[PDB]
Amino acid sequence: RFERDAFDTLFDHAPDKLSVVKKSLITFVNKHLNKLNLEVTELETQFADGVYLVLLMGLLEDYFVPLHHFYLTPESFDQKVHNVSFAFELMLDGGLKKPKARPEDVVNLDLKSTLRVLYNLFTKYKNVE
Numbered sequence: 001r002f003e004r005d006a007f008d009t010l011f012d013h014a015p016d017k018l019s020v021v022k023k024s025l026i027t028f029v030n031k032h033l034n035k036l037n038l039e040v041t042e043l044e045t046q047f048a049d050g051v052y053l054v055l056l057m058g059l060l061e062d063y064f065v066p067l068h069h070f071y072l073t074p075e076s077f078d079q080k081v082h083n084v085s086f087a088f089e090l091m092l093d094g095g096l097k098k099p100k101a102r103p104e105d106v107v108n109l110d111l112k113s114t115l116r117v118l119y120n121l122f123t124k125y126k127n128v129e
Contacts, residue, residue: 007119011112025115028122032059047114048107049074050083057090060125065090080107096124 010018022043029040029052036055040046047053051072058065070086071079085103092098099120101113 007116021115021119025118025122028126029056029118032056035059043115044111045109048109049080050087053087054083054090056121057087060121060128061090061094063090077107
């Protein structure tokens with residue numbers, strides 16, 4: 001909270017290690033997102049509206065996410081935060097750890113928050129086909 005851990009160092013002291021993490025995270029998300037004919041090229045912006053996060057969660061936990069539970073084409077800040085916080089709910093419904101990120105932070109393009117989410121998922125699902 002005021003406690004830095006190893007993951008924080010990627011955004012100041014070790015930019016080289018941030019490059020490795022990013023490449024790895026893209027490799028990982030595309031492994032699952034391509035199954036729905038989707039692709040991420042920009043980690044900095046493409047998870048910010050919640051859509052890919054929700055679908056990624058559906059794919060990871062083999063959960064079929066119904067479209068009235070979220071916003072496939074969000075049109076507002078409220079709809080984006082709904083999506084992200086919903087994705088967090090799917091995580092909790094599966095018994096996963098709550099992310100050290102506020103849904104709003106992801107919508108507001110906070111890279112540290114965005115990447116920590118994906119890295120936590122990557123840590124859990126690294127080996128999943």
